[PDB]
Write a protein that binds this ligand. Structure first.
Ligand SMILES: *[C@@H]1O[C@H](CO)[C@@H](O[C@@H]2O[C@H](CO)[C@@H](O[C@@H]3O[C@H](CO)[C@@H](O)[C@H](O)[C@@H]3O)[C@H](O)[C@H]2NC(C)=O)[C@H](O)[C@H]1NC(C)=O
Ligand SMILES: *[C@@H]1O[C@H](CO)[C@@H](O[C@@H]2O[C@H](CO)[C@@H](O[C@@H]3O[C@H](CO)[C@@H](O)[C@H](O)[C@@H]3O)[C@H](O)[C@H]2NC(C)=O)[C@H](O)[C@H]1NC(C)=O
Ligand SMILES: *[C@@H]1O[C@H](CO)[C@@H](O[C@@H]2O[C@H](CO)[C@@H](O)[C@H](O)[C@H]2NC(C)=O)[C@H](O)[C@H]1NC(C)=O
Ligand SMILES: *[C@@H]1O[C@H](CO)[C@@H](O)[C@H](O)[C@H]1NC(C)=O
Ligand SMILES: *[C@@H]1O[C@H](CO)[C@@H](O)[C@H](O)[C@H]1NC(C)=O
Ligand SMILES: *[C@@H]1O[C@H](CO)[C@@H](O)[C@H](O)[C@H]1NC(C)=O
Ligand SMILES: [Ca+2]
Ligand SMILES: [Ca+2]
Ligand SMILES: [Ca+2]
Ligand SMILES: [Ca+2]
Ligand SMILES: [Ca+2]
Ligand SMILES: [Ca+2]
Ligand SMILES: [Ca+2]
Lengths: 635, 747
C-alpha cells in the first residue's frame, strides 16, 4: 500500500490516490475532514502547517474506489490505520474523489480585487500560485468579519462592491463551511475546501469593509468639528465642497459618533490641507451607518483646487469633566465653554442629567447629587447652563440646553455627582409649536404618543405640564387644535389639577384611554420660558433687516448691543434663516415701539446654531435708549 | 441449451435479494466479471429473481472472494430483457478481466430501507428520514406533493385522513439527501416503490428537506384574531397543538371565501381588518396554492404546506367576512322599514341614534337590497329593543357595498338608554305578489297598500312594468300581460296606482308611481302577468295666505290640468298632513285649522278623501278619490299649519336654547364650530323673535339628541334663511353631541 498525489499544482497538492492489491484507486469525499488531511500529509513528505481538504486543479479521477468514511483522529501514522469501513465496500461517484492541499503557510494569500480600495471587492485566494474565488455558502457578515480582520480593514458591513467588474475569471473555487467570526485568519476557519466542487446558481463572494471610506475631522476649536477627510485605503485625502450633501455629513457624523449635523461649511473655513484631493460624488440615502455603504458616483474628468475643502460642525461639542474627587467617577462638574473651564450651578441640575453625564464618561448609572459644595466650592467662573435631559440621551450634547438669560447663583451652590462606577449597570413633550416650551401636548403611554383633550383644559393644567417640562409657569392653555391636529390615541380627557401636583399624571382624570374627543380638540400650552426671535422694520421689502426682538414671559423685548461679536450676529442670522453672517447697523429709521430690552451682554460659542445656548446676563425688563438697542442686517 | 437448465443465485448477501451474482452451468457455480456492468445489467438481474427495482450495483470486494470459472464478459444489455443470458456476448467462458472479486447487486426488496419522522410536534409529524446504506438521509422537496405525503403516512402507520406537506417545527437535517423528485401516484405501498431519481447524494440547493404532517382531522382548528369579532382579523391556525399564521402567497378573495365558509361567517369581502387588538408573533406559517373556491374547508385544499418555510417579503393573511357587522330591520309595518339591529359576529344588538348618519343608512339599505334611504327616524319610532345597545360610531363614506367595510370609531359604554334606538325607511316598500297561478311566475298582481291587499288596475299597466315585477321575483323577463279577468275578479279594494317603469329597474318600488286622483275601473279590467320562469333570463303643491307671515301656514292648493285648486278635508289624517308638510319644505308634522281671514280667492276643488300610507314622502303616491273640479264651500276647504324647520329646545323660555333643525325625517343639532353672532342673527331672523345678542358653545342649555346636520356655518348676517348660508350640509360634521350650539335672543 502506498499514497500519491496527482495533477495538482505542486508535490503536495491535488488528487489523492492509494494503491491496493496492485491497482491504483481513489478515496471518497464523504468523511474527509481536516484531521484526515493532516494524517494524510503526515504520512506523505509534506509540511503540516496548513492542511486543507479539496481537489485543487484536479479533474475527475479514474479507477476503482478503495476507501470511504475515513474517520481518523490525528493520532495515527497512516490513513489506513484509521477506522475505515471496509475495503471496496461502498459506492461514490467519480465527481467526489478526494484531494488535499498542504502548505507551510508561506504562500497562502488573500486579496480583494475589483473595487475602489483594497478593502472592497471580490475575494481572491492564491494558494500555491493558483488564483481563484470564494463561493457564497453561508457567506454572511459573520463570515466576512474574519476576512476583513485578516486584511486589516475594520469590520464588514455589506456583501457588495461598486466599480471595476473587470476581474480575470477562473474555474477554481474555495468553499467555507462555517466560521465563528472570531478568528484572525480565514486559514484558521474550520474545514475550508479548496477546489474540486463547482458551484452554479451561486455567485462570487463580495466584501466592503469599514476601512473603505473612513471619515475624520482634523482641525477645530471644539471636539466634533473641522475639515472633513476620507481614507482611500492607505491614503488620506480631503473632499471638494461640490461633492457633498447634508446626508453625507449626517452619515459622517454618525460614523464618528458626533450626533446630527448642525453646520456644513464651504471654503477652507478650518484651513487648507496638504494632501491628495478626491473627486467622488457621494449620493447617500441618509440611513447608512457608514460612508462605506454610501453609493458613490465615479470620478469625473475635472479636478478641484486645494482651497475648496468642505468642513463640518456637529452637535456633540460639550466638554464636561469631574474634578476634586477621590475617583474619576465621582466629583464636581466642570464645563468648558467659550474658552475657559468652570463650575456648574444646580438650579436645574437633577438626577436625569447626572445619568447622561455619567454615561458620557462611562461610569454607569448615577447614584446621587451631593448638595452645597461637598467636593469643593467654586474658585473661578461659574457657568449657569440649565440642562433638561430626558435621561435616555447618550451624551450631554443631545440634551436640550438653555444658557441665555440664566440667573446667577452663589459659589456655595455648585452641582457635583457621585456614581456607581460599574459600566454594566444600565414622558411628556410639546410638538409643532416651535421651540421646546410651546406647542401641542403629547404624553407617552402603552408604547405610543397620545394627546390630551380640550375639555376642562385651563391654565392650572398647563401649570403642572410646564412644571414637569421645566419651562416654569404657563401663559396660555390653548385648545381647538391651535398648533395643528395630532395623530394616534387620546390618553386623558378631563383635567382637574390643583396646579400644585408634581407631575401631570398625579391629576384627577377619567382614566387612561377614557376619552370622548377627536383630534380637532387637541390641547396645547405656551409657557413663560418660551423664546422666539424676529427682526422688525416698517413696511420693508426685506424681512431680515432691522431691530432684533426676543420673546420671553409672553412679552417682546430687545437685546443689548454690548459685547456683541461677528459669531453672535451670524448665529442670529442663521436662526432666522437668511444668512450665515451679518453686520450691526446704527439706530435706523429713528422710529420703533418703546418696548424695553430683555437681555444684554450676549456671548456665543462655536457650535450652537440657536441663540438660546449663547450665555448672557440674567433677564431684566428695563427701558433703554435707542442707542442701546440692537439693529442688524444679514447678507 | 435454451437456458431452461441454467439458474442464478444471490450469495453472501444480507438476504435473498442481495449479494454476489452466481450462475450455475455444466454443474459448476461461477461468477460474472464486472466489466461493462451498468444499471441496465442490475435492472435485468433484479427481474428474474423476483426482487424488483434494482437499487445499487457493487464491484470488487463488496461481497468477498468468488470461486469457479467466469462465464460472461463484456456483455451489452438493454433496460428490459427476459434474462441475463439473453444479451449479446463474445462467448461462453471467454473473459479477459484479470480480476478475482466479481460483481454484486442490491435490489430494492433486499435493501434494508426504512422511513421515519423526526423533530415533530407529535409522534408522526415533521421531517422525513430514509435509511440508505446504513445512513439516514433526507428527501428534497422538488415536486413533493400531497400524493407522496399520503404514501408516506400510509407506510408509517398513522392516520391518512388529512396529510399535509412541510416540516413543521423541524430544522434542516445535516447529512445526505438520498431521494429527489418523487412522483408517487397515491397507491404505492412504499415511498421508494414509486418513480424517483436514482439514489445519490444530491446537490439540491434551491429547495429544502421534505417532511409530512399526518392527522385524522380531529386536531385541526382555524380562527381569526385581532378583529372586532370572530369573523374578522388575521387568520390563525392550530394544527395538532401548535399555532401559526397563513402567508399571503396566493391569498385572494377566492381563498378567503373558503375560510369564511369554514367558520360560518358567510362570505369574504376584504383582505384587511381594522385593528382592535395586538396579536402575538409566531414562528411557523402555513402556505397555500390556488384552492378551487368551492371547498367546504381549508383542509381540503390542494397541497397546502404546513411549516418548512419562513414567510418573508410576504405578510400575514387577514380577512373580514360578511357576518362581521350584519344589519337587520325589525319592528316595521312595511318592508324595508324599521329599527336597525346589528349582529356583531354572533350577538344581536340595537344601535343608538347619535351613531348613525345618512351615509350609513344608505349603505345599510344598499346591503339589505332595500334601495335608497328616504328617512331616518329617532326616539324609538318602531319600538325599543330588549338586548345589548352597541356603542360604536359608524364613519361610513358613500358607495360602500356592505356595512362591514366601513371604518368604525369605538366609544365607551353608551350614555343613551334603550329609548333612543334608531330606525330607517328605505325606498323599496312596495309589496306585490302573484296569486292564483299554477306557478309563482304567472298569475294575478296584488298590491298591498294601507293595510290591505288589492287588485291593481291595468289601465296603465304595460309590459315593462311586468318585466320589473318578474325581475323582482327572480323570474326573468315577463312573457305577456293577459287582459280581462283571466285569473279571477278582485275580492276587495281595486288600487289604481299608475306605474311608469322605464324597464331596467330591479324593483317595482324604484319605479315612479302616481296614485293621487287615479281614475276608477271596473271589476273585470284587472292586471295579471305571466313570465318565462328561467331565472337566468335578464303636479305641484303650495300654501297660500293673505300675507306671508311664515312659510307653511295657510290654505293648500294642488296644481293639475294647468290650474290650481284646493284639496278636500274629509278623512285627512296625521300621516297625510305630515307628508304634505314634509313635501312643502317644513317639519314632518302639522295641524289642520279652520279657515282664517276669510279672504282667499274662490278657487274650485280638485281632490277629496286623500289617505297616505307609511313610507312615501310625496303626496302623489297617496291613494285618494279621482280628480273633479267641483265647487266647494270654504267649510270643506283645507288649511294647514306646519311645524317650522328651526326650533329652540330645552331653553328656560322660548327664544332661547339649543338650535334644532329638521332634515331627513329627524331632528338634528348644529355644531358649535364658527358659531358667532351673525349666524345667531340669521337664526333669530328665521324664527320670529327679532335681533340676537349672544351665541353659546358646548351645549350650554343641554346635550342634544340625534344626528348633526350643520357645521362651520358662515352666514354674512343678512341671509333670509339659515339654510341659505354655506355649511358642511347633510352630516359629515365631525362633532360629537358635546358641541351642540345654542342661541339667546331678545324676546
Ligand atoms: C494543473 O495541473 C496540470 C496537470 O494536470 C498542470 O499542467 C502541467 O503542469 C506541469 C508542472 O507540474 C508542467 O510541466 C512543465 O511545464 C513546462 C512548460 O510549462 C516545461 O518547461 C517543463 O518541462 C514541464 O513539462 C506542464 O507543462 C503543465 N501542462 C499543461 C498542459 O498545462 C498545471 O500546471 C496545473 N495548473 C497550474 C495553474 O499550474
Ligand atoms: C417542537 O420540536 C421540539 C424539538 O425540536 C419538541 O421538543 C420536545 O418535545 C417533547 C414532546 O414531544 C416535549 O415534552 C417532553 O416529553 C417527554 C415525554 O414525551 C418528557 O421526557 C419531557 O420531560 C418533556 O415533557 C419536550 O419538552 C420538548 N422539548 C423542547 C426543548 O421543546 C417539541 O415537542 C415540539 N413542539 C413544541 C410545542 O415545542
Ligand atoms: C393667550 O394668548 C393670547 C394671544 O394668543 C393673549 O392675548 C393677548 O394678550 C396680550 C397681553 O400680552 C393683550 O395685550 C392682547 O390684547 C391679547 N389679545 C387678545 C386677542 O385677547 C393672552 O394674553 C394669552 N393668555 C391668556 C390667559 O389668554
Ligand atoms: C475565539 O478565539 C479564541 C482564540 O483561539 C478562542 O480561545 C476562543 O475559544 C474563541 N471563542 C469562540 C466563541 O469560538
Ligand atoms: C369545484 O369546482 C371545480 C371547477 O371549478 C370542479 O372541478 C370541482 O369538482 C368542484 N368541486 C366540488 C366539491 O363541487
Ligand atoms: C338671555 O339674555 C338676556 C338678556 O341679556 C338675559 O336676561 C337672560 O338671562 C339670558 N338667558 C340666559 C339663559 O342666559
Ligand atoms: Ca473523518
Ligand atoms: Ca372641546
Ligand atoms: Ca370630555
Ligand atoms: Ca382643569
Ligand atoms: Ca411528487
Ligand atoms: Ca368646538
Ligand atoms: Ca359664522
Amino acid at each position: 500500500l502506498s499514497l500519491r498525489l496527482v495533477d495538482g499544482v505542486t508535490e503536495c497538492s491535488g488528487r489523492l490516490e492509494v494503491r491496493f492489491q496492485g491497482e491504483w484507486g481513489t478515496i471518497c469525499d464523504d468523511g474527509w475532514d481536516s484531521y484526515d488531511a493532516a494524517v494524510a500529509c503526515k504520512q506523505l513528505g509534506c509540511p503540516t502547517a496548513v492542511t486543507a481538504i479539496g481537489r485543487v486543479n484536479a479533474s475527475k479521477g479514474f479507477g476503482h474506489i478503495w476507501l470511504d468514511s475515513v474517520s481518523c483522529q490525528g493520532h495515527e501514522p497512516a490513513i489506513w490505520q484509521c477506522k475505515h469501513h471496509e475495503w471496496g465496500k461502498h459506492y461514490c461517484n467519480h465527481n467526489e474523489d478526494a484531494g488535499v492541499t498542504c502548505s507551510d503557510g508561506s504562500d497562502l494569500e488573500l486579496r480583494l480585487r475589483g473595487g475602489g480600495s483594497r478593502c472592497a471587492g471580490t475575494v481572491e485566494v492564491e494558494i500555491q500560485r493558483l488564483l481563484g474565488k470564494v463561493c457564497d455558502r453561508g457567506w454572511g457578515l459573520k463570515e466576512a468579519d474574519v476576512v476583513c480582520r485578516q486584511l486589516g480593514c475594520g469590520s464588514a458591513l455589506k456583501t457588495s462592491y461598486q466599480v471595476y467588474s473587470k476581474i480575470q475569471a477562473t474555474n477554481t473555487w474555495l468553499f467555507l463551511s462555517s466560521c465563528n467570526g472570531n478568528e484572525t485568519s480565514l486559514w484558521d476557519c474550520k474545514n475550508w475546501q479548496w477546489g474540486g466542487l463547482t458551484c452554479d446558481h451561486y455567485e462570487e463572494a463580495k466584501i466592503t469593509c469599514s476601512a473603505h471610506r473612513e471619515p475624520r475631522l482634523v482641525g477645530g476649536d471644539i471636539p466634533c468639528s473641522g475639515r472633513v477627510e476620507v481614507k482611500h485605503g492607505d491614503t488620506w485625502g480631503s473632499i471638494c465642497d461640490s461633492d457633498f450633501s447634508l446626508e453625507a455629513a449626517s452619515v459622517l457624523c454618525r460614523e464618528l459618533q458626533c450626533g446630527t449635523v448642525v453646520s456644513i461649511l464651504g471654503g477652507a473655513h478650518f484651513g487648507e490641507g496638504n494632501g491628495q484631493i478626491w473627486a467622488e460624488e457621494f449620493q447617500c440615502e441618509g440611513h447608512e451607518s457608514h460612508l462605506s455603504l454610501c453609493p458613490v458616483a465615479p470620478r469625473p474628468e475635472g479636478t478641484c483646487s486645494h482651497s475648496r475643502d468642505v468642513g463640518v460642525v456637529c452637535s456633540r461639542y460639550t466638554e464636561i469633566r469631574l474634578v476634586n474627587g477621590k475617583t474619576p467617577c465621582e466629583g464636581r462638574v466642570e464645563l468648558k465653554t467659550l474658552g475657559a473651564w468652570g463650575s456648574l450651578c444646580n438650579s436645574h441640575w437633577d438626577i436625569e442629567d447626572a445619568h447622561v453625564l455619567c454615561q458620557q464618561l462611562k461610569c454607569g448609572v448615577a447614584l446621587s447629587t451631593p448638595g452645597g459644595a461637598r467636593f469643593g466650592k467654586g474658585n473661578g467662573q461659574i457657568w449657569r447652563h440649565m440642562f433638561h435631559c430626558t435621561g435616555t440621551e447618550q451624551h450631554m450634547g443631545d440634551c436640550p440646553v438653555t444658557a441665555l438669560g440664566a440667573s446667577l447663583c452663589p459659589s456655595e451652590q455648585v452641582a457635583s455627582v457621585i456614581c456607581s462606577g460599574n459600566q454594566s449597570q444600565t414622558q411628556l413633550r410639546l410638538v409643532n409649536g416651535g421651540g421646546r416650551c410651546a406647542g401641542r401636548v403629547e404624553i407617552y403611554h402603552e408604547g405610543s404618543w397620545g394627546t390630551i383633550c380640550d375639555d376642562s383644559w385651563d391654565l392650572s393644567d398647563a401649570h403642572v405640564v410646564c412644571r414637569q417640562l421645566g419651562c416654569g409657569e404657563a401663559i396660555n392653555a390653548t385648545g381647538s387644535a391651535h398648533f395643528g391636529e395630532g395623530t394616534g390615541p387620546i390618553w386623558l380627557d378631563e383635567m382637574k389639577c390643583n396646579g400644585k401636583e408634581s407631575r401631570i399624571w398625579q391629576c384627577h382624570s377619567h382614566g387612561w384611554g377614557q376619552q370622548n374627543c377627536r383630534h380637532k380638540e387637541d390641547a396645547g400650552v405656551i409657557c413663560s420660558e418660551f423664546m422666539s426671535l424676529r427682526l422688525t422694520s416698517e413696511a420693508s421689502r426685506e424681512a431680515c433687516a432691522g431691530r432684533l426682538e426676543v420673546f420671553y414671559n409672553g412679552a417682546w423685548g430687545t437685546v443689548g448691543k454690548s459685547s456683541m461679536s461677528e459669531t453672535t450676529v451670524g448665529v442670529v442670522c442663521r436662526q432666522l434663516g437668511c444668512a450665515d453672517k451679518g453686520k450691526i447697523n446704527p439706530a435706523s429709521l429713528d422710529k420703533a415701539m418703546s418696548i424695553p430690552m430683555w437681555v444684554d451682554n450676549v456671548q456665543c460659542p462655536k457650535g450652537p446654531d440657536t441663540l438660546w445656548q449663547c450665555p448672557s446676563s440674567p433677564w431684566e425688563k428695563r427701558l433703554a435708549s435707542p442707542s442701546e438697542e440692537t439693529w442688524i442686517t444679514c447678507d
